[PDB]
Amino acid sequence: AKKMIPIDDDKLIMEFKDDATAFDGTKKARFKGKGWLNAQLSVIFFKLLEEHGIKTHFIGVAGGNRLIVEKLDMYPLEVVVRNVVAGSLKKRLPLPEGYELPEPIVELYYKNDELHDPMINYYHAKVLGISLDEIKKIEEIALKVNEILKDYLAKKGIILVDFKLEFGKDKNGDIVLADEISPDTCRFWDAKTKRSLDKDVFRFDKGDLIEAYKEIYERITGEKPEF
Amino acid sequence: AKKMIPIDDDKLIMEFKDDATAFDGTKKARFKGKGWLNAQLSVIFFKLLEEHGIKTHFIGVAGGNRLIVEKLDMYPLEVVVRNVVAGSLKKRLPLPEGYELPEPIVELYYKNDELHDPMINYYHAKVLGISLDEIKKIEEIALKVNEILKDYLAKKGIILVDFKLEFGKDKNGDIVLADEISPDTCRFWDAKTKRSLDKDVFRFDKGDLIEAYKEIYERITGEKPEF
Numbered sequence: 001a002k003k004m005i006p007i008d009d010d011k012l013i014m015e016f017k018d019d020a021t022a023f024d025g026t027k028k029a030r031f032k033g034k035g036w037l038n039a040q041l042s043v044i045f046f047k048l049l050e051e052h053g054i055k056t057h058f059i060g061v062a063g064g065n066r067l068i069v070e071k072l073d074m075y076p077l078e079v080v081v082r083n084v085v086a087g088s089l090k091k092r093l094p095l096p097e098g099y100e101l102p103e104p105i106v107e108l109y110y111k112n113d114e115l116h117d118p119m120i121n122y123y124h125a126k127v128l129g130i131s132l133d134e135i136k137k138i139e140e141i142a143l144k145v146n147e148i149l150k151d152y153l154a155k156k157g158i159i160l161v162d163f164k165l166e167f168g169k170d171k172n173g174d175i176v177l178a179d180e181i182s183p184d185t186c187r188f189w190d191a192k193t194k195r196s197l198d199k200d201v202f203r204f205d206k207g208d209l210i211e212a213y214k215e216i217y218e219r220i221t222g223e224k225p226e227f
Numbered sequence: 228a229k230k231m232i233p234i235d236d237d238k239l240i241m242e243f244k245d246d247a248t249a250f251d252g253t254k255k256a257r258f259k260g261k262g263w264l265n266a267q268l269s270v271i272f273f274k275l276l277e278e279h280g281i282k283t284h285f286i287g288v289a290g291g292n293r294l295i296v297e298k299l300d301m302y303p304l305e306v307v308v309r310n311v312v313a314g315s316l317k318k319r320l321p322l323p324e325g326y327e328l329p330e331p332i333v334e335l336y337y338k339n340d341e342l343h344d345p346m347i348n349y350y351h352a353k354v355l356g357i358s359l360d361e362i363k364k365i366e367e368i369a370l371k372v373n374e375i376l377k378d379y380l381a382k383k384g385i386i387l388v389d390f391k392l393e394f395g396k397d398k399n400g401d402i403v404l405a406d407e408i409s410p411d412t413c414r415f416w417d418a419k420t421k422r423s424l425d426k427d428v429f430r431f432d433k434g435d436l437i438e439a440y441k442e443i444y445e446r447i448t449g450e451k452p453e454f
């Protein structure tokens with residue numbers, strides 16, 4: 001869904017594409033303007049998190065669908081935080097879609113195509129070269145990001161159902177929030193109707209993706225998308 | 228593979244059957260004497276662990292295939308400890324069968340038929356009513372059991388590849404080792420040849436199960452099985 005283009009030893013161009021993919025790449029479509037929306041929303045979320053003292057890779061914008069970001073030594077992880085039961089959590093817990101969790105759940109996934117991103121725990125992570133201290137710091141950050149995003153979104157009639165983060169290490173060996181934060185990588189539900197305003201619209205044919213992503217953008221910024 | 232028969236409020240009969248099952252119950256056979264072997268080996272392992280200060284449910288033997296055990300409030304968990312890469316670990320880590328782990332891996336599985344025993348982490352466990360303190364105590368015990376069994380077995384030319392444990396709570400709220408410890412619930416490899424002396428013989432048609440289980444029994448006790 002994104003192009004990464006080097007600049008020097010220090011930074012990268014992160015370009016968001018109009019392509020959407022689901023079910024291990026077996027479902028595909030293109031949505032004009034999706035790249036733009038995902039980029040803008042990432043910018044907005046990264047700026048919010050920075051103000052709250054979250055170290056992120058965001059440096060700046062490079063016009064349109066492109067962000068300027070700090071190059072990191074990436075952890076091969078996808079870190080999922082979950083507030084409300086949806087998606088794959090229904091295969092691990094005998095709870096219905098929409099069940100409100102008594103506290104957030106953090107799941108670790110091994111980012112590995114050959115193995116299709118299997119869930120892992122702290123012991124697997126250690127065998128992968130990720131110390132317990134590092135894992136603990138990663139989850140601590142993910143849970144803080146959760147709090148800030150859910151609070152900020154709740155005040156806008158949006159429930160943060162779950163979401164995925166990625167992380168890397170900077171030259172100082174600090175753990176820095178990376179990749180993207182968009183309706184591609186989060187579940188957003190309208191607080192009243194409880195309907196999806198995210199990639200689930202594309203996954204399960206729930207309506208128009210662009211319209212749902214625009215709606216998210218409008219309800220967050222108070223403005224209509226210019227493209 | 229086992230019958231559980233109540234006695235009073237305090238204890239249960241644990242009866243080991245000759246039935247073997249694999250691949251979510253899609254492969255089945257009966258092996259005369261398997262019940263006997265599994266019972267005896269469980270007794271031997273529970274006695275070893277008790278001597279080492281592991282609290283287990285073992286009370287006594289009730290002749291033949293039947294053990295007397297303390298009734299516990301069971302945790303709905305299967306706790307897997309792994310020393311050498313085998314089985315499902317090959318789908319989570321890009322490592323070959325027989326790879327020696329730099330340290331043991333503990334995996335938690337939600338004992339749930341509808342969901343087919345999915346792997347879980349500490350956060351899922353908490354939603355299931357299992358506190359972090361409880362999980363930490365459970366893994367602490369599993370890792371101690373690992374050390375004792377692998378040491379004791381290594382001195383007998385047997386590598387403990389991985390194994391599954393189960394636990395419950397007694398009336399004092401102590402965490403007590405439960406269920407069974409047998410060639411059904413462990414991977415045992417001959418140290419020299421590295422061949423399976425466990426249920427994998429039945430899983431992948433590697434030879435005779437009874438002969439492999441007898442071999443385990445003989446190499447552990449120094450005596451031939453009487454039945």
Ligand SMILES: Nc1ncnc2c1ncn2[C@@H]1O[C@H](COP(=O)(O)OP(=O)(O)O)[C@@H](O)[C@H]1O
Binds near residue numbers: 057070168178
């Ligand atoms: N700051 C960063 N430095 C280096 N790599 C990054 C950074 N942020 C994200 N990445 C990586 O760049 C890629 C972004 O493109 P994406 O479409 O997400 O690829 P993928 O299909 O591998 O997830 C991902 O592999 C992601 O982990």
Ligand SMILES: Nc1ncnc2c1ncn2[C@@H]1O[C@H](COP(=O)(O)OP(=O)(O)O)[C@@H](O)[C@H]1O
Binds near residue numbers: 229284393
């Ligand atoms: N001390 C104990 N008290 C109560 N239940 C136990 C104890 N030890 C084992 N169990 C449970 O009894 C059953 C033993 O029979 P088993 O064939 O293992 O059944 P299952 O197919 O459910 O694993 C299991 O459900 C196990 O969790």
Ligand SMILES: Nc1ccn([C@@H]2O[C@H](COP(=O)(O)OP(=O)(O)O)[C@@H](O)[C@H]2O)c(=O)n1
Binds near residue numbers: 078086089163199
């Ligand atoms: N490879 C992945 C997997 C999940 N996710 C996101 O992480 C959250 C958890 O998704 P999930 O575990 O239910 O997986 P799916 O339902 O997406 O298959 C969802 O918001 C997904 O959008 C992601 O961005 N990338």
Ligand SMILES: Nc1ccn([C@@H]2O[C@H](COP(=O)(O)OP(=O)(O)O)[C@@H](O)[C@H]2O)c(=O)n1
Binds near residue numbers: 315411412413414
């Ligand atoms: N339901 C289960 C699952 C695994 N196990 C044991 O736990 C260890 C880990 O097995 P595994 O995770 O590779 O699963 P399988 O290879 O048995 O499918 C093996 O020694 C199994 O014999 C068990 O006793 N009961």
Ligand SMILES: [Mg+2]
């Ligand atoms: Mg990605």
Ligand SMILES: [Mg+2]
């Ligand atoms: Mg059992």
